Write an enzyme that holds these catalytic residues in place. Structure first.
Site, PDB file in Angstrom:
ATOM      1  N   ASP A 181       0.836  -1.179   0.000  1.00 15.08           N
ATOM      2  CA  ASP A 181       0.000   0.000   0.000  1.00 15.08           C
ATOM      3  C   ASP A 181       0.881   1.242   0.000  1.00 15.08           C
ATOM      4  OD1 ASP A 181      -1.989   2.052   0.722  1.00 15.08           O
ATOM      5  OD2 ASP A 181      -3.256   0.249   1.034  1.00 15.08           O
ATOM      6  N   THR A 195      -6.876   4.008  -1.606  1.00 12.41           N
ATOM      7  CA  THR A 195      -6.762   2.527  -1.574  1.00 12.41           C
ATOM      8  C   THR A 195      -7.913   1.762  -2.097  1.00 12.41           C
ATOM      9  OG1 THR A 195      -5.391   2.715   0.216  1.00 12.41           O
ATOM     10  CG2 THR A 195      -6.311   0.567  -0.014  1.00 12.41           C
ATOM     11  N   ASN A 217     -12.798   5.904  -0.805  1.00 11.61           N
ATOM     12  CA  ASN A 217     -12.668   5.250   0.490  1.00 11.61           C
ATOM     13  C   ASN A 217     -13.886   5.587   1.375  1.00 11.61           C
ATOM     14  OD1 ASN A 217     -10.174   4.173  -0.056  1.00 11.61           O
ATOM     15  ND2 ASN A 217      -8.994   5.479   1.341  1.00 11.61           N
ATOM     16  N   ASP A 230       2.497   2.650   3.192  1.00 12.81           N
ATOM     17  CA  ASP A 230       1.547   3.754   3.291  1.00 12.81           C
ATOM     18  C   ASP A 230       1.490   4.397   4.667  1.00 12.81           C
ATOM     19  OD1 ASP A 230      -0.675   5.101   1.767  1.00 12.81           O
ATOM     20  OD2 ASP A 230      -1.889   4.375   3.433  1.00 12.81           O
ATOM     21  N   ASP A 239      -0.812   0.194  -4.887  1.00  7.99           N
ATOM     22  CA  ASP A 239      -2.080   0.833  -5.238  1.00  7.99           C
ATOM     23  C   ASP A 239      -1.953   2.306  -5.646  1.00  7.99           C
ATOM     24  OD1 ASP A 239      -1.562   1.564  -2.534  1.00  7.99           O
ATOM     25  OD2 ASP A 239      -3.692   1.405  -1.971  1.00  7.99           O
ATOM     26  N   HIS A 261      -2.121  11.104  -0.149  1.00  6.38           N
ATOM     27  CA  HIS A 261      -2.291  10.742  -1.549  1.00  6.38           C
ATOM     28  C   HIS A 261      -3.782  10.858  -1.847  1.00  6.38           C
ATOM     29  CE1 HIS A 261      -4.018   6.930   0.084  1.00  6.38           C
ATOM     30  NE2 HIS A 261      -3.072   7.068   0.989  1.00  6.38           N
ATOM     31  N   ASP A 319     -20.569  13.616 -25.757  1.00  5.54           N
ATOM     32  CA  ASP A 319     -20.777  12.812 -24.576  1.00  5.54           C
ATOM     33  C   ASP A 319     -21.646  13.597 -23.586  1.00  5.54           C
ATOM     34  OD1 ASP A 319     -20.693  10.712 -22.920  1.00  5.54           O
ATOM     35  OD2 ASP A 319     -18.694  11.070 -22.068  1.00  5.54           O
ATOM     36  N   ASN A 370     -20.628   9.441 -19.999  1.00  3.55           N
ATOM     37  CA  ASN A 370     -20.322   8.041 -19.696  1.00  3.55           C
ATOM     38  C   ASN A 370     -19.054   7.581 -20.429  1.00  3.55           C
ATOM     39  OD1 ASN A 370     -21.216   7.641 -22.295  1.00  3.55           O
ATOM     40  ND2 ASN A 370     -22.790   6.101 -21.813  1.00  3.55           N
ATOM     41  N   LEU A 397     -18.533   7.396 -23.512  1.00  4.99           N
ATOM     42  CA  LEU A 397     -18.869   6.623 -24.729  1.00  4.99           C
ATOM     43  C   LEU A 397     -19.603   7.516 -25.736  1.00  4.99           C
ATOM     44  CD1 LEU A 397     -20.363   3.408 -23.114  1.00  4.99           C
ATOM     45  CD2 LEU A 397     -18.002   3.781 -23.792  1.00  4.99           C
TER      46      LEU A 397
END
Ligand SMILES: *[C@@H]1O[C@H](CO)[C@@H](O[C@@H]2O[C@H](CO)[C@@H](O[C@@H]3O[C@H](CO[C@H]4O[C@H](CO)[C@@H](O)[C@H](O[C@H]5O[C@H](CO)[C@@H](O)[C@H](O)[C@@H]5O[C@H]5O[C@H](CO)[C@@H](O)[C@H](O)[C@@H]5O)[C@@H]4O)[C@@H](O)[C@H](O)[C@@H]3O)[C@H](O)[C@H]2NC(C)=O)[C@H](O)[C@H]1NC(C)=O
Ligand SMILES: O=C1N=C(N2CCN(Cc3ccc(B(O)O)cc3)CC2)S/C1=C\c1ccc(Cl)c(Cl)c1
Ligand SMILES: *[C@@H]1O[C@H](CO)[C@@H](O[C@@H]2O[C@H](CO)[C@@H](O)[C@H](O)[C@H]2NC(C)=O)[C@H](O)[C@H]1NC(C)=O
Ligand SMILES: *[C@@H]1O[C@H](CO)[C@@H](O[C@@H]2O[C@H](CO)[C@@H](O)[C@H](O)[C@H]2NC(C)=O)[C@H](O)[C@H]1NC(C)=O
Ligand SMILES: [Ca+2]
Ligand SMILES: [K+]
Ligand code: NA
Ligand SMILES: [Zn+2]
Ligand SMILES: [Zn+2]
Length: 787
Positions: free
Chosen positions: A121, A159, A180, A261, A308, A414, A667, A671, A673
């Site tokens: 980590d 993480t 998180n 970490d 990570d 981070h 777009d 999304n 796409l």
């Protein structure tokens, strides 16, 4: 409820799927308060530590010991990892020289090389520079195996989003772990680092590697470990599982450490206090490799050593407070720190005023250390918008800073934009399937799931990696990619109309008396992009450019051209300032009209091939064709004209010419796409001319810069952008200045992979080149970061 009275004899770390009401003995039972009463006495032995000593050699087997140094321990699979070194005159793995592993060297009974993922980590990429002085086992893996100088995490660089991206190949907006901490407005529930909610399966989308393996008949060892199980025990358990009967032994295993970490947060990434946890992690890798060697598996197993995210210098003294900008911060909830997400404190509070909040947060201090964004305006490369758990209002925070709601034990943190250098993390692969002593370019963590599937012979679930783009990491087990099929073939209209047929409102001051010819060979260097959806479009040729003009969206899908190193930039003559010309190859009914632009007080227009770069004054007239026109807000034209007039020639001068492909992106639903027609939400005033949400450009040259872009023999170099098409420049705090002071800064923020453009356009690029398809897939995933 769990019947605790049961026992964990001969059950320790069992791979049994066991639940209510039976008590558990597996690596996650403590996390569920579901362990048998004696799990800790029988399964978490600590007696006499983790290392054989010379005296213990050939001892009588006491089952109270954490690990064993008795004569029998080896076939039993529970020796201390240094047993043979201390007791049998063997060398530590790290002290043996590297030798190439050309095919797996596995014991009888192994049908495939096992995969062990060793995750760490907060392991910043630059920690590897500490080298064998600090981390000799890791340095051996790195120098002898296949290594990247760094691996790019996903945003946010924390993480949970990253570990689950590693497991699934998905962007957080797709897997659902967008932070998180998160609030889900439909559940009306909050996911916290701490606590129980996160255990509810309803949060976790996509299909993680252990599920893909299980569903395809491949046994996975349990990836998660209750926090109370020490690292030495996790290693011993993996080693024990590897010693199981052929019909029980797993094929994939994971180890996880919270270091470095934890120490990075406390001490900062460049703190002297970092050496000790790096040493401790290396020691753990040592135990694993010593252990594998004792089992005869050190030339059998593939090992991935991966982090990570990294770690930046962040302290209390560098905190912005929203209360300095906003009058009533007690009414909002802020997910704070190295990113910001804002919602009202009371869900759906009707008095919540996001436009007013954003106004007060926009360029209000000259040194401001965050920038607000509605999520659809965040750089498309972050892929961070298409999920209900992502608040509409986001703050992108400057590296080394925090943002907090209102007014030191830490020096590192981070979470920042994933192209930030301090956020990059580590990748090493070592073993028979990886190459020997090979460096590979940095790549993104979304690509690893496909590779792990390849290593295990699995078919990956649908994910965001580009399968094949990492084939160059592997000796064998590569994935053979196949070129997607073109869905719509182009039309090649000749002259079919008279200037007389057109009533568009256009005017231009332009002897009465445009074939393919060599246009393609000069301006379309890598083949026509294939159109991968059902639509209707025309190839249009010109002296200076070629385009694929859509009859449905009334503008080019793509416009391709090559600019030589020596090319000339020229003005637009005064009498041509407002020149727009009908295009006799395309129906008046499939053409835009200049009247819409006249009427739209807010919308102007731009051109895809810029008149500034015309080859001759007569060729320049081609650039004013209505089929080269696109709708652009004046704010955007500031950026675009600077790009067209100054930057493209600068790139050509620096890269020995460049090939450019430019075009629109729709777009509206953010999304990532290509929108279908129904999804487009804005048109030029009074018309059916759709307004792009972004404009892209893909700029290609020869990696060998001594060769001109048009005569390139070998590998290519690419940089690309997806620029937001916005009615103001509020994003750029210095935009009141000349464009030389702010436009390139904006473009750098909106850098993109060619693959990102492909998703957004339904086009497929680079179909006709001298390179392999795997090499091209690598090219298309490249991100020019400007760091
Ligand atoms: C990165 O790669 C992924 C994976 O290929 C692409 O995501 C896919 O996009 C397609 C096309 O839009 C979606 O297809 C739709 O599928 C739905 C049915 O979807 C349900 O069933 C599938 C299959 O089991 C399941 O994966 C879906 O899971 C989504 O929804 C769950 C419950 O809400 C959620 O827990 C999970 O995290 C995931 O949510 C994400 O997707 C939804 C859209 O479905 C989105 O609203 C949400 O915000 C998340 O982004 C789901 O239960 C059909 O009804 C449609 O007609 C259509 O076929 C896929 O569902 C989707 N797959 C996943 C896992 O997200 C991304 O496009 C790609 N990104 C880029 C930029 O290329
Ligand atoms: O055994 C494990 N324990 C895990 N934890 C529990 C502790 N928890 C503490 C924590 C929370 C946040 C952060 B971060 O933002 O730096 C770090 C640690 C991290 C996740 S993750 C895990 C193993 C695992 C290994 C490989 C993969 Cl691919 C996955 Cl998804 C999980
Ligand atoms: C929970 O576990 C205990 C302990 O194993 C169970 O107790 C056993 O029950 C059986 C059947 O009633 C007895 O014959 C045994 O003497 C008990 N075993 C031992 C070793 O004590 C108990 O039944 C379980 N309770 C449940 C399922 O609710
Ligand atoms: C945006 O910032 C302005 C200050 O620049 C805030 O306006 C002040 O706040 C209160 C209540 O509106 C007034 O009594 C003061 O007179 C205002 N000061 C000035 C200089 O105008 C405003 O409240 C902020 N808006 C938000 C949404 O936070
Ligand atoms: Ca879309
Ligand atoms: K106008
Ligand atoms: Na501005
Ligand atoms: Zn982490
Ligand atoms: Zn952390």
């Amino acid at each position: 409820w769990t019947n605790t009275s049961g026992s964990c004899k001969g059950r320790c770390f069992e791979l049994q799927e066991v639940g209510p009401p039976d008590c558990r003995c597996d690596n996650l039972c403590k996390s569920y308060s579901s362990c048998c009463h004696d799990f800790d006495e029988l399964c978490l032995k600590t007696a006499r530590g983790w290392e054989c000593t010379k005296d213990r050699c050939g001892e009588v087997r006491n089952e109270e010991n954490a690990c064993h140094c008795s004569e029998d321990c080896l076939s039993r699979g529970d020796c201390c990892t240094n047993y043979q070194v201390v007791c049998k005159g063997e060398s530590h793995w790290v002290d043996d020289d590297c030798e190439e592993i050309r095919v797996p060297e596995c014991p009888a009974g192994f049908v495939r090389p096992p995969l062990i993922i060793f995750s760490v980590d907060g392991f910043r990429a630059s920690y590897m520079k500490k080298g064998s002085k600090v981390m000799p086992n890791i340095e051996k893996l790195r120098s002898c195996g296949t290594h990247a100088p760094y691996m790019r995490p996903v945003y946010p660089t924390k993480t949970f989003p990253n570990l689950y991206t590693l497991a699934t190949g998905l962007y957080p907006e797709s897997h659902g772990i967008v932070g998180n901490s998160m609030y889900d407005p439909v559940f009306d529930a909050t996911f916290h680092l701490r606590g129980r909610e996160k255990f509810n399966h309803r949060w976790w989308g996509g299909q993680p590697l252990w599920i893909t393996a299980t569903k395809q008949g491949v046994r996975a060892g349990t990836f998660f470990w209750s926090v109370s199980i020490p690292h030495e025990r996790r290693i011993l358990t993996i080693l024990q599982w590897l010693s199981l009967p052929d019909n029980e032994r797993p094929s994939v295993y994971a180890f996880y450490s919270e270091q470095p970490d934890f120490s990075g947060h406390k001490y900062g990434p460049f703190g002297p206090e970092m050496t000790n946890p790096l040493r401790e992690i290396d020691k753990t890798v040592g135990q694993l490799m010593d252990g594998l060697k004792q089992l005869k598996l050190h030339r059998c197993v593939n090992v991935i050593f991966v982090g990570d995210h990294g770690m930046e210098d962040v302290t209390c003294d560098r905190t912005e407070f929203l209360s300095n900008y906003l009058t009533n911060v007690d009414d909002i909830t802020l997910v704070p720190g190295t990113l910001g997400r804002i919602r009202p404190k009371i869900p759906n509070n009707l008095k919540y005023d996001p436009k007013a909040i954003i106004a007060n947060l926009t360029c209000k201090k000259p040194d401001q250390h965050f920038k607000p964004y509605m999520k659809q305006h965040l750089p498309k490369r972050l892929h961070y918008a298409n999920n209900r758990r992502i608040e509409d209002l986001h703050l992108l925070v400057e590296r080394r800073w925090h943002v907090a709601r209102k007014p030191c034990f830490f020096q590192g943190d981070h979470g920042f934009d994933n192209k930030v250098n301090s956020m990059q993390t580590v990748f090493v692969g070592y073993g028979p399937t990886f190459k020997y002593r090979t460096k590979v370019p940095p790549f993104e963590n979304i690509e690893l799931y496909n590779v792990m599937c390849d290593l295990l012979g699995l078919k990956p679930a649908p994910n965001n990696g580009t399968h094949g783009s990492l084939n160059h990491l592997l000796r064998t087990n590569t994935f053979r990619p196949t070129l997607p099929e073109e869905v719509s073939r182009p039309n090649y209209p000749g002259i079919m109309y008279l200037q007389s047929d057109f009533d568009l409102g256009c005017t231009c001051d332009d002897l009465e008396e445009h074939t393919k010819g060599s246009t393609e060979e000069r301006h379309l260097l890598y083949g026509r992009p294939a159109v991968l959806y059902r639509t209707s479009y025309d190839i249009l040729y010109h002296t200076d450019f070629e385009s694929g003009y859509s009859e449905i969206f009334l503008m080019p899908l793509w416009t391709s051209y090559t600019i030589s190193k020596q090319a000339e930039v020229s003005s637009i003559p005064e009498h041509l300032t407002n020149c727009v010309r009908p295009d006799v190859r395309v129906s008046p009914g499939f053409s835009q009209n200049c009247l819409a632009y006249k009427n739209d007080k807010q919308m102007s227009y731009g051109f895809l091939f810029p008149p500034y770069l015309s080859s001759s004054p007569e060729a320049k007239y081609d650039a004013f064709l209505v089929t080269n026109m696109v709708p652009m807000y004046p704010a955007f034209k500031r950026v675009w004209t600077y790009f067209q007039r100054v930057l493209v020639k600068k790139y050509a001068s620096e890269r020995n010419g460049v090939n450019v492909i430019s075009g629109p992106i729709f777009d509206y639903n953010y999304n990532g796409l290509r929108d279908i027609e129904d999804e487009i939400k804005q048109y030029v005033e009074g018309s059916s001319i759709p307004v792009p949400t972004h404009y892209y450009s893909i700029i290609t040259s020869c990696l060998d810069f001594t060769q001109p872009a048009d005569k390139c023999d070998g590998p290519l170099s690419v940089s690309s952008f997806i620029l937001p098409h916005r009615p103001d420049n509020d994003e750029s705090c210095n935009s009141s200045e000349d464009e030389s002071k702010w436009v390139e800064e904006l473009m750098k923020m909106h850098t993109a992979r060619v693959r990102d453009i492909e998703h957004l356009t339904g086009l497929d690029f680079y179909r006709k080149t001298s390179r392999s398809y795997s090499e091209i897939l690598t090219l298309k995933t490249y991100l020019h970061t400007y760091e």
